[PDB]
């Protein structure tokens, strides 16, 4: 339906199409795909795993019984020992830090299992398994509908404005529809995003910039938002690709030099962005959610497919506008249908759990994105 | 000159092959 | 093999190919080339050297016995005396500084040995030796392999996703390979990089911006990083060219105002850059090493040849993909091999040592880059 | 006022393109070596010149 194709293409331009991954369907459900791995370092092979098991867990009572040429591993990272009794000279009691110290002081060395083919073929060893699995799921296409293009006396008004009223009204309805769709998306992103948390939530409680706390400049929020990006980098294989916040939360609050107001509307920024942060990422402004929150997360692709995202969107086309001449009011109705979902695999260990859940079930996917984090913000209201 | 494999190199290091028995 | 060519060219786009020198091989080992030397000012000529020795070492006991027209040297730099008894009016007891001062006050003059044609041809003099020495080394090509292309029930899923699946899968598997290669490189860079050290390590200990020290803004790290560049400049005829740091170490920390998050990328940045610093060289990010470090260093070329780097990379092709359809599992394997190394001569006085070591042996090359430094960082965790 | 003066053209010279077994090394690196070494030699010359300036 070319007219619907045109309405869709000319209307979805108004939703945050890039803060979600976009896929498409032609089925009553959308077949969505996504990628996940449980740990990031070195090879994921069984041969490797065994060699690691065969050397040590780096018990703090054993960390210094090692000598030059030995291997050890810790938290799946394999290291080789430089000189004798590594850590003998490190007073640090916290092994995580003692290791960082040993690495920087060249007491230990980050180790690679790369080797000649001869090693592998002679051994007739195993090979790295996949780190990431690809999961698929199907989520029903849902819809929203308007019966709002009021005509009657209004038809007379539209005729008075007949210059361009036919399309105007459809364009406006399409706009309002896009707005509602975008809201649905934002609610889903809000819901799925993991609660950012450090030491009991953002340094033992959600960031609080309230008047009784820190009505500073907004600098402190920027810092925490930036830290959310580091989280994305730390726990995944991607850097943040987008950020969304309410006006009070950041589109305005961070506009104290930590946010740029779309100085260019075509450079590293979509047409629907409010701007981009001082530290990049297009920034979208929610404006509706009472939360006054900030979300940092990723959307990414392999070739043409936006396989990575916390939320996935898959419109079902074959933006339908019709007129219903009921009474004296032949109003314009508008329906839009799409699937919207999170990857159900983030709440499942395997297919026997995945088969009894739904990526579109936001009552279960809540807080389980792993490709996004949300910061609750207490504001100086 | 002629009782060895030659397998002339086109770079130092560089290598030769041999039909070593499995032993 | 055109398919290796296509897969390799289309996948190495994902590794930090520019934070190492890129060379190539076609041999089981890579013939790597590179340049190192002992110092950086004026000439490398023997006759000039002897002249230095024939004028004075400038011990403080002799600095005042010099008069107008005399030459003297210090730290291999020749300086000329302006007027009599240079330094007579300089109270400074440390010759390094007294000299610094004398030059500023025009008591002495940096000496140029540019000379007339007569000087050279008349004496039938010697000629300057090399400032630089050029090395070659041979490092074995190691492989790393993946058995990550899981297909079976997955094959059916791939058929369901047959729109994209054939190449999608190889591209994904190739992506994971790129990740491992990149990580492998980073471990080597971390290991080889010299510990940046000032007065007993970066102002008498690794820089510490932790809560137990200075949870400031991150400004003090930016200052230390900028100094790391200084170090490269003082020690070698290059400025830093690139920087890599963890997310917490700089990608986020410097977000405080010393980092630009890629406002532009069709100019001066690699596609895999996070962004660049306020005293920027493209900023890359590892995201894995527990160190939370910063590396500053330099790659450089003569025409097409990247003769300078702390680490060199030389892939060997004839990204190879294979299938092993045992039972119902036509899974995909991916094989990549390359040599990775540091210039082994940085740990050797001569060829009798270089010939018994391996630039790919990161136990010996540890801390001996000289074309890069690493900073350990204690963060406000 | 416009002034004029003259000074001697002065020079520097290097013997740094070392060859012998080095030629063999350069031959091993023969795909680039002829020009590469001259460019390299020119580079160290440029470096000292810049310093002289």
From Swiss-Prot, chains A, C:
InterPro entries: CAPSP, Gp23/Gp24_T4-like
UniProt GO cellular component terms: viral capsid
Disulfide cysteine pairs (residue numbers): none
Family under the similarity heading: Belongs to the Tevenvirinae capsid vertex family.
UniProt keyword terms in alphabetical order: Capsid protein, Late protein, Virion
HAMAP family from the UniProt entry: CAPSID_P_T4
Pfam families noted in UniProt: Gp23
Record's comment on post-translational modification: Proteolytic cleavage at the N-terminus by the prohead core protein protease gives rise to the mature capsid vertex protein.
Role description: Capsid protein that self-associates to form pentons, building the capsid in association with hexamers of the major capsid protein and one dodecamer of the portal protein. The capsid vertex protein self-associates to form 11 pentons, building the T=13 laevo capsid in association with 160 hexamers of the major capsid protein.
Protein origin, superkingdom: Viruses
Full protein name: Capsid vertex protein
Subunit description: Homopentamer. Interacts with the portal protein. Interacts with the major capsid protein that forms 160 hexamers.
Gene name of the encoded protein: 24
From Swiss-Prot, chain B:
Annotated family: Belongs to the Tevenvirinae major capsid protein family.
Its biological purpose: Major capsid protein that self-associates to form hexamers, building most of the capsid in association with pentons made of the capsid vertex protein and one dodecamer of the portal protein. The major capsid protein self-associates to form 160 hexamers, building most of the T=13 laevo capsid. Folding of major capsid protein requires the assistance of two chaperones, the host chaperone groL acting with the phage encoded gp23-specific chaperone, gp31. The capsid also contains two nonessential outer capsid proteins, Hoc and Soc, which decorate the capsid surface.
Part of the full-length chain shown: 109 to 131 of 521
Modifications made to the protein after synthesis: A proteolytic cleavage by the prohead core protein protease gives rise to the mature major capsid protein during virus maturation.
Coiled-coil regions listed in the entry: none
Subunit structure: Homohexamer. Interacts with the portal protein. Interacts with the capsid vertex protein that forms pentamers. Interacts with hoc; one hoc molecule associates with each capsid hexamer. Interacts with soc; this interaction reinforces the capsid structure. A total of 960 subunits of the major capsid protein forms the 160 hexamers.
Domain of life per record: Viruses
UniProt gene name: gp23
Protein's UniProt name: Major capsid protein
UniProtKB/Swiss-Prot annotation, chain D:
Changes after translation: Proteolytic cleavage at the N-terminus by the prohead core protein protease gives rise to the mature capsid vertex protein.
Segment forming the signal sequence: none
Similarity-based family: Belongs to the Tevenvirinae capsid vertex family.
Function: Capsid protein that self-associates to form pentons, building the capsid in association with hexamers of the major capsid protein and one dodecamer of the portal protein. The capsid vertex protein self-associates to form 11 pentons, building the T=13 laevo capsid in association with 160 hexamers of the major capsid protein.
Subunit and interaction comment: Homopentamer. Interacts with the portal protein. Interacts with the major capsid protein that forms 160 hexamers.
Protein name as annotated: Capsid vertex protein
Gene: 24
């Amino acid at each position: 339906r070319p007219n619907l194709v045109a309405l869709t293409r000319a209307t979805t331009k108004l939703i945050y199409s890039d803060i979600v991954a976009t896929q498409r369907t032609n089925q009553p459900v959308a077949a969505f795909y996504g990628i996940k791995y449980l740990n990031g370092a070195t090879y994921a092979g069984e041969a490797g795993y065994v060699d690691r098991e065969q050397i040590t867990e780096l018990t703090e009572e054993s960390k210094l019984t090692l000598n030059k040429g030995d291997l050890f591993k810790y938290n799946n990272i394999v290291y080789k020992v430089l000189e004798d009794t590594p850590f003998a000279t490190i007073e640090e009691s916290d092994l995580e830090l003692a290791l960082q110290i040993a690495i920087v002081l060249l007491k230990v060395r980050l180790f690679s299992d790369a080797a000649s083919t001869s090693k592998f073929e002679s051994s007739d060893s195993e090979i790295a398994d996949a780190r990431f699995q690809i999961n698929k799921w199907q989520t029903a296409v849902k819809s929203r509908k308007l019966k709002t293009g009021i005509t009657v006396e209004l038809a007379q008004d539209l005729e008075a404005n007949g210059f361009d009223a036919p399309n105007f009204l459809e364009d406006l309805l399409a706009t309002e529809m896009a707005d509602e769709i975008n809201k649905d998306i934002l609610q889903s992103l809000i819901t799925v995003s993991k609660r950012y948390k450090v030491t009991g939530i953002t340094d033992s409680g959600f960031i609080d910039l309230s008047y009784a706390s820190a009505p500073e400049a907004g600098r402190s929020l920027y810092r925490m938002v930036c830290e959310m990006v580091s989280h994305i980098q730390k726990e995944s294989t991607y850097t943040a690709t987008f950020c969304v916040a309410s006006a009070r939360a950041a589109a305005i609050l961070a506009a104290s030099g930590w946010l740029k107001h779309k100085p260019e509307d075509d450079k590293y920024l979509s047409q629907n962005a409010y701007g981009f942060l001082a530290n990049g990422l297009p920034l979208y402004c929610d404006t509706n959610s009472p939360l006054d929150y900030v979300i940092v997360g990723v959307v990414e692709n392999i070739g043409e497919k936006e396989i990575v995202g916390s939320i996935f969107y898959a419109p079902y086309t074959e933006f339908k506008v019709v007129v219903d001449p009921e009474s004296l009011q032949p109003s314009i109705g508008l329906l839009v249908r799409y699937a919207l979902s999170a990857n159900p695999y983030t709440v499942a260990k395997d297919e026997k759990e995945a088969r009894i859940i739904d990526g579109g079930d936001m009552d279960k996917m809540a807080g389980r994105s792993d490709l996004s984090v949300l910061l609750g913000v207490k504001l100086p209201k | 000159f002629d009782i060895c494999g030659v397998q002339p190199m086109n770079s130092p290091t560089g290598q030769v092959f041999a039909l070593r028995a499995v032993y």
